[PDB]
Amino acid sequence: TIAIVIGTHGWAAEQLLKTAEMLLGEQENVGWIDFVPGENAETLIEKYNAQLAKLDTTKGVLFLVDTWGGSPFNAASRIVVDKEHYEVIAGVNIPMLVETLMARDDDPSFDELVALAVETGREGVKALKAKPV
Amino acid sequence: TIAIVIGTHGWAAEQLLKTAEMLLGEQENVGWIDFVPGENAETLIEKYNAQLAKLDTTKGVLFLVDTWGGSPFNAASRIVVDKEHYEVIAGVNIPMLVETLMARDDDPSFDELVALAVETGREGVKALKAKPV
Amino acid sequence: NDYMVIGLARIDDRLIHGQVATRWTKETNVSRIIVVSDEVAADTVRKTLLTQVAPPGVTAHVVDVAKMIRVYNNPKYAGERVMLLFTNPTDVERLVEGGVKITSVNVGGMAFRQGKTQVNNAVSVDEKDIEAFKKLNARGIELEVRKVSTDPKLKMMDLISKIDK
């Protein structure tokens, strides 16, 4: 399947994956990294590369990161730059992770998966508000 | 300030808060809960209530949860039902948490904060894609 | 048998929870979902929320056990594949007694509670739930326990056999 790597400031990436697996069961072909104060983008590039070495990246790689412009995002950006089937998507949330992991098994094309991740991530943000009676 | 409670399946809520504090510094008036297999919504309602007892809820309470329809969401829904200035927003992500925590200090109205959280959460989901040269 | 076709029977006191209904809907190829519960049917507020969050392309219906037996007695859904959602195995034995045909029952999840015994990570059974499962098994009906189709399938009798003799 298409490889997924999750990166956030701190230690949240591992937990977002754990949460997803609590919902979907253990996942294959997924990696994650942490970012600790004192580290820079170059440290992170190495961390991402070490994770990729263990993943099947033949169909592509989708980096799901916490926020646009942070170190995790900047480092991932440097890796995907002139690579086909490599993308970085900021704002990772559980709806995005769950929908993306579910679709991945039905072997979608890379563009299809990227589009689904952005759409489900955004549609997943919703307020309860008053309900009709 | 307006109280914020984060709830997600598993143990991710504490880490999402830690990540936010890595970006913004330690936060006040924020609570979180975990959800372990074997627990039900009633267990979670108690957990949320115990957290609320320690928070200043005079201006309102915003529950930020992982996904629409999960136990964390269902339990939070039962608490906010006929309460003024209580809301549940699904799809919590770092952009939403950071923007929401930042605005909270400028003492916005409850409706203003709820609207900002949904808007920043959604706008935070964005793919890098090819860039112009 | 020449009437509606039960694509799958999932038991869950939460009905739709997480992506379990979304993923199970696509894998089970189900375009219709019927909820059988008198307690929920009496909650107009909950019915509205479930109907407004019904997955796209999928319709969610809310009916009582007595009304459900009649909907199945109508060939209007013949061949149609529908998923049955229950909150307790007791309501499943009732449909069978009405002449409903069930080949197997899948346990999705059951909120734990005091006085009950935990058989799985989130599945609890009381002397009443166990008694219903034994009757279904005595009728040659298969009972499988699993949270997601991607998780290993376990036999309800095996889990209750290592607890209740």
Curated annotation (Swiss-Prot), chains A, B:
Induction: Expression of the manXYZ operon is positively regulated by the cAMP-CRP complex and negatively regulated by the Mlc transcriptional repressor. Expression is also weakly repressed by NagC. The modification Phosphohistidine is found at H9. Changing S71C: Slight phosphotransferase activity. Unable to dimerize. The record marks V88 as: Involved in the phosphoryl transfer between H-10 and H-175. It is found in: Cytoplasm; Cell inner membrane. Changing H85N: Loss of phosphotransferase activity. The active site is at H9 (tele-phosphohistidine intermediate). Homodimer. The PTS EIIA type-4 domain is phosphorylated by phospho-HPr on a histidyl residue. Then, it transfers the phosphoryl group to the PTS EIIB type-4 domain. This is PTS system mannose-specific EIIAB component. The lineage of its organism: Bacteria, Pseudomonadati, Pseudomonadota, Gammaproteobacteria, Enterobacterales. The gene is manX. The chain holds residues 2 to 134 of 323 of the full protein.
